[PDB]
Design a protein around this ligand. Structure first.
Ligand SMILES: [Ca+2]
Ligand SMILES: [Ca+2]
Lengths: 150, 143
């Protein structure tokens, strides 16, 4: 039971669940551990990715399913990093790396993630990720030079 | 007095000082509010900028004054954001934009800053910034 956990640990578990969900992702189970109005933010705004609802994130996942296979998604905290928890603000900050096998190659970058939970600290209300814009523009470019469906 | 403030507010003020120091930066006063062993980290590692001591930061500040004039440095939090403070870990996280005027170009980008203070919450022990790598590489190539 999450509510038996100390608030600090509860926030970390609930924030961490985002990466476990992505690691075990199945279209038949969808995005779990989120509030109905949870929003995903992609920083910086200069990258041009608009804020997205649970449903819009689902549509992105469904869309890329048809264009590229995704396998072996892996998320880990950068070694030596510790979760930054602001209990009063229901916020958790991780320093993260994400790995995945996309089509014929490796996706792998480094991120800042900022989670915000509901008042109870049991569901994610907002996910924000600051992204490696040079890497992501390059990935997007190679993606555009690729035949849809491989 | 800083030790008169509650820790949360003292951590924010110590973290915030970094940007006020940058805004009024003067070679003859240098980098204030930092422990002597303070380290500036520039994320992501893929950007290829190595960690720097107080003195290596001053060196870079000095080396840039000869190539281009910098004026009207302004730092502000992204509206709607709040400082994220982890009292136990002496950590503060800001969502920031930074503005400056160079050899007639505007510099302006959005960042995450992560500050770590000393145990008293009076001085900066570490500053980490996650930068906009597409834009910072452009900028660095333009020079
Ligand atoms: Ca990478
Ligand atoms: Ca910019």
């Amino acid at each position: 039971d999450l509510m038996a956990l100390p608030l600090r640990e509860r926030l970390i578990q609930t924030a961490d669940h985002y990466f476990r969900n992505m690691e075990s992702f199945d279209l038949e189970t969808g995005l779990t551990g989120r509030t109905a109005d949870c929003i995903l933010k992609v920083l910086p705004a200069s990258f041009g990715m608009p804020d997205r609802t649970n449903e819009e994130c689902m549509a992105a996942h469904i869309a890329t399913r048809a264009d590229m296979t995704m396998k072996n998604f892996k998320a880990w905290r950068v070694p030596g990093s510790i979760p930054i928890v602001d209990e009063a603000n229901r916020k958790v900050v991780f320093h993260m790396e994400i790995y995945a096998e996309m089509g014929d190659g490796v996706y792998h970058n480094e991120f800042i993630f900022i989670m915000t939970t509901n008042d109870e600290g049991t569901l994610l209300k907002e996910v924000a990720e600051y992204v490696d814009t040079a890497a992501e523009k390059k990935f997007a470019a190679e993606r555009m030079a690729r035949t849809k469906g491989s």
